[PDB]
Amino acid sequence: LANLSELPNIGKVLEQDLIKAGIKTPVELKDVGSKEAFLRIWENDSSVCMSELYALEGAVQGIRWHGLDEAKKIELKKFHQSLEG
Amino acid sequence: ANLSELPNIGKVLEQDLIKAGIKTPVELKDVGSKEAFLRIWENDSSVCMSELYALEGAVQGIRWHGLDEAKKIELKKFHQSLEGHHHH
């Protein structure tokens, strides 16, 4: 398998945060999905941001996040809004 | 993407960037954080280290909190020099 940090949108720091949250490979990331991965990281470090949720979803979909469809961006913004608070 | 969809860029920093002629993420990457910071600082010298870190983190696609230590020190040296504290 690829390293998490080779996936689109996932740099070294997001890879470290995923690993610290228990998500260690692309297969684990796709299994849990972006929203749940984000929440797990948030439980450790609440500085993880709306942009990093977009990055995780892009990684799951295998695309740079700028290209996410509009409905998905709005869904993820609505999720991040529900959390904060 | 909009500027305010990039990591660390709030609505007010997006407005400051636009006012300084930096209107898109591509335009921000093209000029980089130090030039973008100078442009906003020229308009408002109250912008400060926080904004510089935010801008570099935006360029790198990461929360500023994750910037490498070398980059953070590089940015601090630049900011200190701008604000009247060059190294001796």
Side-chain angles (χ1 to χ4, degrees):
Chain A
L1 309 182
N3 291 332
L4 285 167
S5 58
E6 299 178 279
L7 302 182
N9 316 293
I10 298 183
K12 283 3 182 287
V13 76
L14 200 43
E15 170 175 65
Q16 288 183 332
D17 285 340
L18 285 166
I19 291 162
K20 291 165 178 173
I23 300 166
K24 296 163 170 9
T25 70
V27 166
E28 297 172 18
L29 172 65
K30 282 187 61 162
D31 272 345
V32 300
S34 64
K35 292 178 193 166
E36 176 71 16
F38 186 87
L39 291 184
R40 292 187 199 179
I41 294 165
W42 191 90
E43 288 178 355
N44 293 333
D45 183 351
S46 58
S47 72
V48 66
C49 73
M50 178 71 232
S51 294
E52 286 175 289
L53 177 58
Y54 285 178
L56 291 168
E57 178 72 17
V60 162
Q61 293 190 26
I63 62 168
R64 196 161 67 98
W65 71 254
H66 300 48
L68 287 169
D69 63 271
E70 193 63 39
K72 183 60 73 181
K73 296 161 77 183
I74 289 167
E75 180 189 346
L76 297 174
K77 193 162 154 198
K78 285 175 251 128
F79 179 82
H80 182 262
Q81 284 177 325
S82 76
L83 180 67
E84 300 221 312
Chain B
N2 282 314
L3 288 165
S4 63
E5 294 171 305
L6 304 179
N8 321 299
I9 307 193
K11 293 70 155 194
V12 169
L13 182 51
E14 168 175 68
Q15 291 168 332
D16 291 340
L17 282 166
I18 291 167
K19 288 186 230 271
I22 298 164
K23 312 196 217 329
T24 70
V26 293
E27 286 173 31
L28 176 63
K29 183 178 173 289
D30 285 340
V31 303
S33 62
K34 291 182 186 152
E35 178 172 333
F37 181 87
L38 281 174
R39 287 165 66 174
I40 61 172
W41 179 84
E42 172 172 34
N43 286 343
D44 178 2
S45 77
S46 302
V47 298
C48 66
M49 199 57 217
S50 308
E51 279 91 350
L52 183 54
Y53 281 171
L55 291 170
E56 181 63 27
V59 170
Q60 291 195 32
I62 64 175
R63 66 191 189 281
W64 61 267
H65 314 65
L67 287 166
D68 60 87
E69 193 65 40
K71 183 56 69 183
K72 291 183 188 144
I73 288 165
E74 175 190 358
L75 294 172
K76 186 176 277 204
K77 289 318 142 303
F78 168 68
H79 185 255
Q80 285 167 357
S81 303
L82 281 183
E83 285 291 355
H85 302 275
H86 277 77
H87 79 70
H88 294 175

PDB file of all heavy atoms in Angstrom, chain A residues 23-58:
ATOM      1  N   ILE A  23      -5.429   5.491  12.425  1.00  0.00           N
ATOM      2  CA  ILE A  23      -5.698   5.238  10.993  1.00  0.00           C
ATOM      3  C   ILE A  23      -4.364   5.257  10.300  1.00  0.00           C
ATOM      4  O   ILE A  23      -3.740   6.312  10.206  1.00  0.00           O
ATOM      5  CB  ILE A  23      -6.612   6.334  10.492  1.00  0.00           C
ATOM      6  CG1 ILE A  23      -7.914   6.335  11.275  1.00  0.00           C
ATOM      7  CG2 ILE A  23      -6.810   6.235   8.968  1.00  0.00           C
ATOM      8  CD1 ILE A  23      -8.669   7.567  11.043  1.00  0.00           C
ATOM      9  N   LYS A  24      -3.884   4.086   9.914  1.00  0.00           N
ATOM     10  CA  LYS A  24      -2.485   3.932   9.580  1.00  0.00           C
ATOM     11  C   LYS A  24      -2.174   3.691   8.119  1.00  0.00           C
ATOM     12  O   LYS A  24      -1.018   3.785   7.731  1.00  0.00           O
ATOM     13  CB  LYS A  24      -1.882   2.850  10.450  1.00  0.00           C
ATOM     14  CG  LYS A  24      -1.906   3.264  11.924  1.00  0.00           C
ATOM     15  CD  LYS A  24      -1.704   2.094  12.864  1.00  0.00           C
ATOM     16  CE  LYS A  24      -1.481   2.516  14.305  1.00  0.00           C
ATOM     17  NZ  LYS A  24      -1.698   3.930  14.604  1.00  0.00           N
ATOM     18  N   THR A  25      -3.196   3.423   7.290  1.00  0.00           N
ATOM     19  CA  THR A  25      -2.983   3.077   5.847  1.00  0.00           C
ATOM     20  C   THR A  25      -4.151   3.663   5.052  1.00  0.00           C
ATOM     21  O   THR A  25      -5.194   4.029   5.643  1.00  0.00           O
ATOM     22  CB  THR A  25      -2.996   1.571   5.603  1.00  0.00           C
ATOM     23  OG1 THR A  25      -4.317   1.078   5.770  1.00  0.00           O
ATOM     24  CG2 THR A  25      -2.052   0.860   6.587  1.00  0.00           C
ATOM     25  N   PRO A  26      -4.010   3.776   3.700  1.00  0.00           N
ATOM     26  CA  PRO A  26      -5.101   4.260   2.881  1.00  0.00           C
ATOM     27  C   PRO A  26      -6.335   3.372   3.025  1.00  0.00           C
ATOM     28  O   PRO A  26      -7.436   3.858   2.939  1.00  0.00           O
ATOM     29  CB  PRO A  26      -4.529   4.157   1.477  1.00  0.00           C
ATOM     30  CG  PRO A  26      -3.032   4.397   1.689  1.00  0.00           C
ATOM     31  CD  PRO A  26      -2.744   3.655   2.937  1.00  0.00           C
ATOM     32  N   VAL A  27      -6.176   2.084   3.199  1.00  0.00           N
ATOM     33  CA  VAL A  27      -7.321   1.201   3.353  1.00  0.00           C
ATOM     34  C   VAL A  27      -8.095   1.530   4.614  1.00  0.00           C
ATOM     35  O   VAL A  27      -9.330   1.605   4.601  1.00  0.00           O
ATOM     36  CB  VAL A  27      -6.903  -0.296   3.342  1.00  0.00           C
ATOM     37  CG1 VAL A  27      -8.051  -1.178   3.839  1.00  0.00           C
ATOM     38  CG2 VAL A  27      -6.369  -0.734   1.989  1.00  0.00           C
ATOM     39  N   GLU A  28      -7.385   1.799   5.713  1.00  0.00           N
ATOM     40  CA  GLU A  28      -8.042   2.209   6.953  1.00  0.00           C
ATOM     41  C   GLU A  28      -8.762   3.553   6.809  1.00  0.00           C
ATOM     42  O   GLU A  28      -9.869   3.739   7.311  1.00  0.00           O
ATOM     43  CB  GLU A  28      -7.072   2.210   8.148  1.00  0.00           C
ATOM     44  CG  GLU A  28      -6.549   0.845   8.442  1.00  0.00           C
ATOM     45  CD  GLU A  28      -5.465   0.766   9.463  1.00  0.00           C
ATOM     46  OE1 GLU A  28      -5.285   1.722  10.249  1.00  0.00           O
ATOM     47  OE2 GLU A  28      -4.800  -0.297   9.532  1.00  0.00           O
ATOM     48  N   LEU A  29      -8.146   4.475   6.101  1.00  0.00           N
ATOM     49  CA  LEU A  29      -8.751   5.793   5.874  1.00  0.00           C
ATOM     50  C   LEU A  29     -10.018   5.661   5.073  1.00  0.00           C
ATOM     51  O   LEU A  29     -11.041   6.246   5.431  1.00  0.00           O
ATOM     52  CB  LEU A  29      -7.798   6.789   5.218  1.00  0.00           C
ATOM     53  CG  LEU A  29      -8.409   8.099   4.796  1.00  0.00           C
ATOM     54  CD1 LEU A  29      -8.904   8.889   6.004  1.00  0.00           C
ATOM     55  CD2 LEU A  29      -7.286   8.924   4.131  1.00  0.00           C
ATOM     56  N   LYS A  30      -9.989   4.908   3.982  1.00  0.00           N
ATOM     57  CA  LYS A  30     -11.208   4.728   3.183  1.00  0.00           C
ATOM     58  C   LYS A  30     -12.299   3.991   3.963  1.00  0.00           C
ATOM     59  O   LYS A  30     -13.474   4.293   3.833  1.00  0.00           O
ATOM     60  CB  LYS A  30     -10.881   4.033   1.906  1.00  0.00           C
ATOM     61  CG  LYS A  30     -10.258   4.932   0.853  1.00  0.00           C
ATOM     62  CD  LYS A  30     -10.108   4.206  -0.502  1.00  0.00           C
ATOM     63  CE  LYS A  30     -11.421   3.751  -1.097  1.00  0.00           C
ATOM     64  NZ  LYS A  30     -11.358   3.416  -2.630  1.00  0.00           N
ATOM     65  N   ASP A  31     -11.920   3.040   4.794  1.00  0.00           N
ATOM     66  CA  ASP A  31     -12.868   2.324   5.603  1.00  0.00           C
ATOM     67  C   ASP A  31     -13.634   3.226   6.552  1.00  0.00           C
ATOM     68  O   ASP A  31     -14.840   3.104   6.697  1.00  0.00           O
ATOM     69  CB  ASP A  31     -12.211   1.214   6.456  1.00  0.00           C
ATOM     70  CG  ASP A  31     -12.087  -0.114   5.793  1.00  0.00           C
ATOM     71  OD1 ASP A  31     -12.753  -0.308   4.751  1.00  0.00           O
ATOM     72  OD2 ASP A  31     -11.353  -0.999   6.368  1.00  0.00           O
ATOM     73  N   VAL A  32     -12.915   4.104   7.234  1.00  0.00           N
ATOM     74  CA  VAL A  32     -13.569   4.965   8.245  1.00  0.00           C
ATOM     75  C   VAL A  32     -14.225   6.179   7.601  1.00  0.00           C
ATOM     76  O   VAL A  32     -15.268   6.612   8.055  1.00  0.00           O
ATOM     77  CB  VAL A  32     -12.643   5.374   9.338  1.00  0.00           C
ATOM     78  CG1 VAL A  32     -12.061   4.144  10.123  1.00  0.00           C
ATOM     79  CG2 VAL A  32     -11.641   6.263   8.855  1.00  0.00           C
ATOM     80  N   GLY A  33     -13.682   6.660   6.485  1.00  0.00           N
ATOM     81  CA  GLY A  33     -14.175   7.802   5.793  1.00  0.00           C
ATOM     82  C   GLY A  33     -13.639   9.099   6.400  1.00  0.00           C
ATOM     83  O   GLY A  33     -13.152   9.162   7.532  1.00  0.00           O
ATOM     84  N   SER A  34     -13.776  10.164   5.623  1.00  0.00           N
ATOM     85  CA  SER A  34     -13.225  11.451   6.003  1.00  0.00           C
ATOM     86  C   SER A  34     -13.827  12.033   7.250  1.00  0.00           C
ATOM     87  O   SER A  34     -13.107  12.549   8.101  1.00  0.00           O
ATOM     88  CB  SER A  34     -13.369  12.453   4.871  1.00  0.00           C
ATOM     89  OG  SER A  34     -14.723  12.711   4.584  1.00  0.00           O
ATOM     90  N   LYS A  35     -15.150  11.961   7.394  1.00  0.00           N
ATOM     91  CA  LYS A  35     -15.799  12.572   8.536  1.00  0.00           C
ATOM     92  C   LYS A  35     -15.346  11.917   9.836  1.00  0.00           C
ATOM     93  O   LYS A  35     -15.031  12.589  10.812  1.00  0.00           O
ATOM     94  CB  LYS A  35     -17.316  12.548   8.434  1.00  0.00           C
ATOM     95  CG  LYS A  35     -17.878  13.454   7.303  1.00  0.00           C
ATOM     96  CD  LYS A  35     -19.377  13.344   7.224  1.00  0.00           C
ATOM     97  CE  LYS A  35     -19.976  13.930   6.006  1.00  0.00           C
ATOM     98  NZ  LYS A  35     -21.424  13.388   6.001  1.00  0.00           N
ATOM     99  N   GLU A  36     -15.391  10.579   9.859  1.00  0.00           N
ATOM    100  CA  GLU A  36     -15.011   9.897  11.092  1.00  0.00           C
ATOM    101  C   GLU A  36     -13.543  10.043  11.367  1.00  0.00           C
ATOM    102  O   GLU A  36     -13.112  10.181  12.517  1.00  0.00           O
ATOM    103  CB  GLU A  36     -15.381   8.412  10.995  1.00  0.00           C
ATOM    104  CG  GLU A  36     -14.955   7.553  12.185  1.00  0.00           C
ATOM    105  CD  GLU A  36     -15.745   7.840  13.419  1.00  0.00           C
ATOM    106  OE1 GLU A  36     -16.834   8.475  13.341  1.00  0.00           O
ATOM    107  OE2 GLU A  36     -15.265   7.427  14.496  1.00  0.00           O
ATOM    108  N   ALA A  37     -12.693   9.996  10.323  1.00  0.00           N
ATOM    109  CA  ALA A  37     -11.277  10.225  10.536  1.00  0.00           C
ATOM    110  C   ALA A  37     -11.050  11.596  11.165  1.00  0.00           C
ATOM    111  O   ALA A  37     -10.247  11.779  12.070  1.00  0.00           O
ATOM    112  CB  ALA A  37     -10.464  10.098   9.186  1.00  0.00           C
ATOM    113  N   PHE A  38     -11.714  12.584  10.600  1.00  0.00           N
ATOM    114  CA  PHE A  38     -11.634  13.949  11.145  1.00  0.00           C
ATOM    115  C   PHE A  38     -12.018  14.058  12.611  1.00  0.00           C
ATOM    116  O   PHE A  38     -11.300  14.674  13.419  1.00  0.00           O
ATOM    117  CB  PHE A  38     -12.513  14.887  10.312  1.00  0.00           C
ATOM    118  CG  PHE A  38     -12.376  16.328  10.703  1.00  0.00           C
ATOM    119  CD1 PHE A  38     -11.397  17.141  10.153  1.00  0.00           C
ATOM    120  CD2 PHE A  38     -13.267  16.885  11.578  1.00  0.00           C
ATOM    121  CE1 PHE A  38     -11.311  18.456  10.530  1.00  0.00           C
ATOM    122  CE2 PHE A  38     -13.151  18.227  11.983  1.00  0.00           C
ATOM    123  CZ  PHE A  38     -12.166  18.968  11.443  1.00  0.00           C
ATOM    124  N   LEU A  39     -13.137  13.432  12.988  1.00  0.00           N
ATOM    125  CA  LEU A  39     -13.519  13.421  14.378  1.00  0.00           C
ATOM    126  C   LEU A  39     -12.522  12.756  15.275  1.00  0.00           C
ATOM    127  O   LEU A  39     -12.307  13.229  16.395  1.00  0.00           O
ATOM    128  CB  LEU A  39     -14.889  12.727  14.561  1.00  0.00           C
ATOM    129  CG  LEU A  39     -16.138  13.436  14.018  1.00  0.00           C
ATOM    130  CD1 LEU A  39     -17.375  12.592  14.410  1.00  0.00           C
ATOM    131  CD2 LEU A  39     -16.317  14.839  14.578  1.00  0.00           C
ATOM    132  N   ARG A  40     -11.905  11.659  14.841  1.00  0.00           N
ATOM    133  CA  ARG A  40     -10.881  10.998  15.651  1.00  0.00           C
ATOM    134  C   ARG A  40      -9.699  11.922  15.837  1.00  0.00           C
ATOM    135  O   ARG A  40      -9.198  12.057  16.946  1.00  0.00           O
ATOM    136  CB  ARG A  40     -10.481   9.654  15.048  1.00  0.00           C
ATOM    137  CG  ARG A  40     -11.627   8.656  15.141  1.00  0.00           C
ATOM    138  CD  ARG A  40     -11.341   7.171  14.715  1.00  0.00           C
ATOM    139  NE  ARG A  40     -12.588   6.464  14.443  1.00  0.00           N
ATOM    140  CZ  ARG A  40     -12.687   5.210  14.042  1.00  0.00           C
ATOM    141  NH1 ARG A  40     -11.611   4.464  13.884  1.00  0.00           N
ATOM    142  NH2 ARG A  40     -13.900   4.721  13.797  1.00  0.00           N
ATOM    143  N   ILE A  41      -9.268  12.595  14.784  1.00  0.00           N
ATOM    144  CA  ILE A  41      -8.145  13.538  14.955  1.00  0.00           C
ATOM    145  C   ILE A  41      -8.558  14.687  15.877  1.00  0.00           C
ATOM    146  O   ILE A  41      -7.801  15.022  16.784  1.00  0.00           O
ATOM    147  CB  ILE A  41      -7.701  14.107  13.613  1.00  0.00           C
ATOM    148  CG1 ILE A  41      -7.090  13.012  12.699  1.00  0.00           C
ATOM    149  CG2 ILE A  41      -6.743  15.250  13.833  1.00  0.00           C
ATOM    150  CD1 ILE A  41      -7.004  13.502  11.268  1.00  0.00           C
ATOM    151  N   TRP A  42      -9.766  15.187  15.700  1.00  0.00           N
ATOM    152  CA  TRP A  42     -10.265  16.258  16.539  1.00  0.00           C
ATOM    153  C   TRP A  42     -10.296  15.961  18.040  1.00  0.00           C
ATOM    154  O   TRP A  42     -10.105  16.847  18.841  1.00  0.00           O
ATOM    155  CB  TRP A  42     -11.596  16.781  15.970  1.00  0.00           C
ATOM    156  CG  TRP A  42     -12.180  18.020  16.496  1.00  0.00           C
ATOM    157  CD1 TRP A  42     -11.970  19.273  16.059  1.00  0.00           C
ATOM    158  CD2 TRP A  42     -13.053  18.110  17.599  1.00  0.00           C
ATOM    159  NE1 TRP A  42     -12.696  20.175  16.836  1.00  0.00           N
ATOM    160  CE2 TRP A  42     -13.351  19.467  17.796  1.00  0.00           C
ATOM    161  CE3 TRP A  42     -13.599  17.170  18.453  1.00  0.00           C
ATOM    162  CZ2 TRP A  42     -14.217  19.907  18.795  1.00  0.00           C
ATOM    163  CZ3 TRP A  42     -14.502  17.642  19.475  1.00  0.00           C
ATOM    164  CH2 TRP A  42     -14.755  18.959  19.628  1.00  0.00           C
ATOM    165  N   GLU A  43     -10.545  14.722  18.399  1.00  0.00           N
ATOM    166  CA  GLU A  43     -10.469  14.292  19.781  1.00  0.00           C
ATOM    167  C   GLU A  43      -9.061  14.399  20.349  1.00  0.00           C
ATOM    168  O   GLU A  43      -8.869  14.506  21.566  1.00  0.00           O
ATOM    169  CB  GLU A  43     -10.956  12.871  19.913  1.00  0.00           C
ATOM    170  CG  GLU A  43     -12.459  12.730  19.754  1.00  0.00           C
ATOM    171  CD  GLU A  43     -12.912  11.241  19.846  1.00  0.00           C
ATOM    172  OE1 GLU A  43     -12.050  10.340  19.936  1.00  0.00           O
ATOM    173  OE2 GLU A  43     -14.108  10.983  19.791  1.00  0.00           O
ATOM    174  N   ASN A  44      -8.048  14.335  19.491  1.00  0.00           N
ATOM    175  CA  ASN A  44      -6.695  14.512  19.963  1.00  0.00           C
ATOM    176  C   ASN A  44      -6.214  15.941  19.850  1.00  0.00           C
ATOM    177  O   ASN A  44      -5.428  16.390  20.677  1.00  0.00           O
ATOM    178  CB  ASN A  44      -5.736  13.618  19.128  1.00  0.00           C
ATOM    179  CG  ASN A  44      -5.961  12.145  19.355  1.00  0.00           C
ATOM    180  OD1 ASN A  44      -6.431  11.743  20.434  1.00  0.00           O
ATOM    181  ND2 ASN A  44      -5.571  11.315  18.375  1.00  0.00           N
ATOM    182  N   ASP A  45      -6.611  16.625  18.770  1.00  0.00           N
ATOM    183  CA  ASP A  45      -6.158  17.958  18.488  1.00  0.00           C
ATOM    184  C   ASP A  45      -7.251  18.728  17.805  1.00  0.00           C
ATOM    185  O   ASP A  45      -7.531  18.549  16.629  1.00  0.00           O
ATOM    186  CB  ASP A  45      -4.888  17.872  17.598  1.00  0.00           C
ATOM    187  CG  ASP A  45      -4.286  19.193  17.303  1.00  0.00           C
ATOM    188  OD1 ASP A  45      -4.879  20.259  17.613  1.00  0.00           O
ATOM    189  OD2 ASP A  45      -3.157  19.194  16.711  1.00  0.00           O
ATOM    190  N   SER A  46      -7.902  19.571  18.566  1.00  0.00           N
ATOM    191  CA  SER A  46      -9.077  20.306  18.054  1.00  0.00           C
ATOM    192  C   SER A  46      -8.709  21.444  17.152  1.00  0.00           C
ATOM    193  O   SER A  46      -9.603  22.184  16.729  1.00  0.00           O
ATOM    194  CB  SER A  46      -9.919  20.762  19.232  1.00  0.00           C
ATOM    195  OG  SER A  46      -9.108  21.584  20.085  1.00  0.00           O
ATOM    196  N   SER A  47      -7.430  21.618  16.825  1.00  0.00           N
ATOM    197  CA  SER A  47      -6.999  22.615  15.851  1.00  0.00           C
ATOM    198  C   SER A  47      -7.195  22.161  14.407  1.00  0.00           C
ATOM    199  O   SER A  47      -7.153  23.015  13.503  1.00  0.00           O
ATOM    200  CB  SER A  47      -5.524  23.037  16.100  1.00  0.00           C
ATOM    201  OG  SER A  47      -4.594  22.037  15.753  1.00  0.00           O
ATOM    202  N   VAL A  48      -7.424  20.876  14.189  1.00  0.00           N
ATOM    203  CA  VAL A  48      -7.725  20.354  12.835  1.00  0.00           C
ATOM    204  C   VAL A  48      -8.934  21.101  12.298  1.00  0.00           C
ATOM    205  O   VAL A  48      -9.918  21.401  12.999  1.00  0.00           O
ATOM    206  CB  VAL A  48      -7.894  18.851  12.859  1.00  0.00           C
ATOM    207  CG1 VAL A  48      -9.142  18.429  13.660  1.00  0.00           C
ATOM    208  CG2 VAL A  48      -7.811  18.213  11.447  1.00  0.00           C
ATOM    209  N   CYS A  49      -8.784  21.483  11.044  1.00  0.00           N
ATOM    210  CA  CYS A  49      -9.593  22.528  10.455  1.00  0.00           C
ATOM    211  C   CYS A  49     -10.457  22.076   9.303  1.00  0.00           C
ATOM    212  O   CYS A  49     -10.226  20.988   8.734  1.00  0.00           O
ATOM    213  CB  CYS A  49      -8.672  23.679  10.033  1.00  0.00           C
ATOM    214  SG  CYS A  49      -7.627  23.429   8.571  1.00  0.00           S
ATOM    215  N   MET A  50     -11.428  22.920   8.938  1.00  0.00           N
ATOM    216  CA  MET A  50     -12.342  22.617   7.835  1.00  0.00           C
ATOM    217  C   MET A  50     -11.610  22.212   6.558  1.00  0.00           C
ATOM    218  O   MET A  50     -11.971  21.254   5.862  1.00  0.00           O
ATOM    219  CB  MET A  50     -13.258  23.789   7.538  1.00  0.00           C
ATOM    220  CG  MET A  50     -14.180  23.499   6.366  1.00  0.00           C
ATOM    221  SD  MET A  50     -15.456  22.296   6.778  1.00  0.00           S
ATOM    222  CE  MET A  50     -15.297  21.094   5.487  1.00  0.00           C
ATOM    223  N   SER A  51     -10.525  22.888   6.260  1.00  0.00           N
ATOM    224  CA  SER A  51      -9.716  22.563   5.118  1.00  0.00           C
ATOM    225  C   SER A  51      -9.140  21.160   5.170  1.00  0.00           C
ATOM    226  O   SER A  51      -9.010  20.547   4.138  1.00  0.00           O
ATOM    227  CB  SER A  51      -8.609  23.620   4.990  1.00  0.00           C
ATOM    228  OG  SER A  51      -9.202  24.852   4.696  1.00  0.00           O
ATOM    229  N   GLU A  52      -8.765  20.678   6.354  1.00  0.00           N
ATOM    230  CA  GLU A  52      -8.210  19.364   6.500  1.00  0.00           C
ATOM    231  C   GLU A  52      -9.293  18.291   6.359  1.00  0.00           C
ATOM    232  O   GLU A  52      -9.049  17.193   5.836  1.00  0.00           O
ATOM    233  CB  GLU A  52      -7.462  19.253   7.800  1.00  0.00           C
ATOM    234  CG  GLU A  52      -6.145  19.987   7.730  1.00  0.00           C
ATOM    235  CD  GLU A  52      -5.436  19.992   9.045  1.00  0.00           C
ATOM    236  OE1 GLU A  52      -5.937  20.698   9.940  1.00  0.00           O
ATOM    237  OE2 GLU A  52      -4.427  19.246   9.183  1.00  0.00           O
ATOM    238  N   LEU A  53     -10.561  18.601   6.689  1.00  0.00           N
ATOM    239  CA  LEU A  53     -11.678  17.729   6.341  1.00  0.00           C
ATOM    240  C   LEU A  53     -11.822  17.603   4.812  1.00  0.00           C
ATOM    241  O   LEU A  53     -11.987  16.474   4.300  1.00  0.00           O
ATOM    242  CB  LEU A  53     -12.942  18.225   7.025  1.00  0.00           C
ATOM    243  CG  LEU A  53     -14.246  17.469   6.719  1.00  0.00           C
ATOM    244  CD1 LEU A  53     -14.180  15.946   7.081  1.00  0.00           C
ATOM    245  CD2 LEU A  53     -15.383  18.121   7.409  1.00  0.00           C
ATOM    246  N   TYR A  54     -11.743  18.685   4.077  1.00  0.00           N
ATOM    247  CA  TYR A  54     -11.759  18.636   2.615  1.00  0.00           C
ATOM    248  C   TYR A  54     -10.604  17.795   2.108  1.00  0.00           C
ATOM    249  O   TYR A  54     -10.784  16.924   1.238  1.00  0.00           O
ATOM    250  CB  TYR A  54     -11.616  20.018   1.996  1.00  0.00           C
ATOM    251  CG  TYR A  54     -12.822  20.911   2.057  1.00  0.00           C
ATOM    252  CD1 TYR A  54     -12.763  22.169   1.574  1.00  0.00           C
ATOM    253  CD2 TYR A  54     -14.024  20.484   2.563  1.00  0.00           C
ATOM    254  CE1 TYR A  54     -13.902  23.032   1.573  1.00  0.00           C
ATOM    255  CE2 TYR A  54     -15.147  21.337   2.588  1.00  0.00           C
ATOM    256  CZ  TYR A  54     -15.056  22.583   2.109  1.00  0.00           C
ATOM    257  OH  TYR A  54     -16.229  23.415   2.093  1.00  0.00           O
ATOM    258  N   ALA A  55      -9.407  17.945   2.694  1.00  0.00           N
ATOM    259  CA  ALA A  55      -8.228  17.151   2.310  1.00  0.00           C
ATOM    260  C   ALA A  55      -8.459  15.666   2.510  1.00  0.00           C
ATOM    261  O   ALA A  55      -8.113  14.863   1.599  1.00  0.00           O
ATOM    262  CB  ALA A  55      -6.998  17.616   3.154  1.00  0.00           C
ATOM    263  N   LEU A  56      -9.039  15.272   3.633  1.00  0.00           N
ATOM    264  CA  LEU A  56      -9.310  13.869   3.877  1.00  0.00           C
ATOM    265  C   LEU A  56     -10.289  13.304   2.893  1.00  0.00           C
ATOM    266  O   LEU A  56     -10.112  12.199   2.418  1.00  0.00           O
ATOM    267  CB  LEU A  56      -9.820  13.687   5.297  1.00  0.00           C
ATOM    268  CG  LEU A  56      -8.781  13.930   6.396  1.00  0.00           C
ATOM    269  CD1 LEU A  56      -9.387  14.021   7.745  1.00  0.00           C
ATOM    270  CD2 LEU A  56      -7.630  12.935   6.381  1.00  0.00           C
ATOM    271  N   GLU A  57     -11.352  14.050   2.548  1.00  0.00           N
ATOM    272  CA  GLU A  57     -12.310  13.573   1.579  1.00  0.00           C
ATOM    273  C   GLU A  57     -11.686  13.453   0.210  1.00  0.00           C
ATOM    274  O   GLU A  57     -11.928  12.506  -0.525  1.00  0.00           O
ATOM    275  CB  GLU A  57     -13.591  14.444   1.605  1.00  0.00           C
ATOM    276  CG  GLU A  57     -14.589  13.997   0.557  1.00  0.00           C
ATOM    277  CD  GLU A  57     -15.266  12.696   0.877  1.00  0.00           C
ATOM    278  OE1 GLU A  57     -15.259  12.234   2.022  1.00  0.00           O
ATOM    279  OE2 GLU A  57     -15.841  12.038  -0.019  1.00  0.00           O
ATOM    280  N   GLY A  58     -10.892  14.428  -0.205  1.00  0.00           N
ATOM    281  CA  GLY A  58     -10.147  14.290  -1.428  1.00  0.00           C
ATOM    282  C   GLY A  58      -9.246  13.115  -1.473  1.00  0.00           C
ATOM    283  O   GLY A  58      -9.218  12.380  -2.459  1.00  0.00           O
TER     284      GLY A  58
END
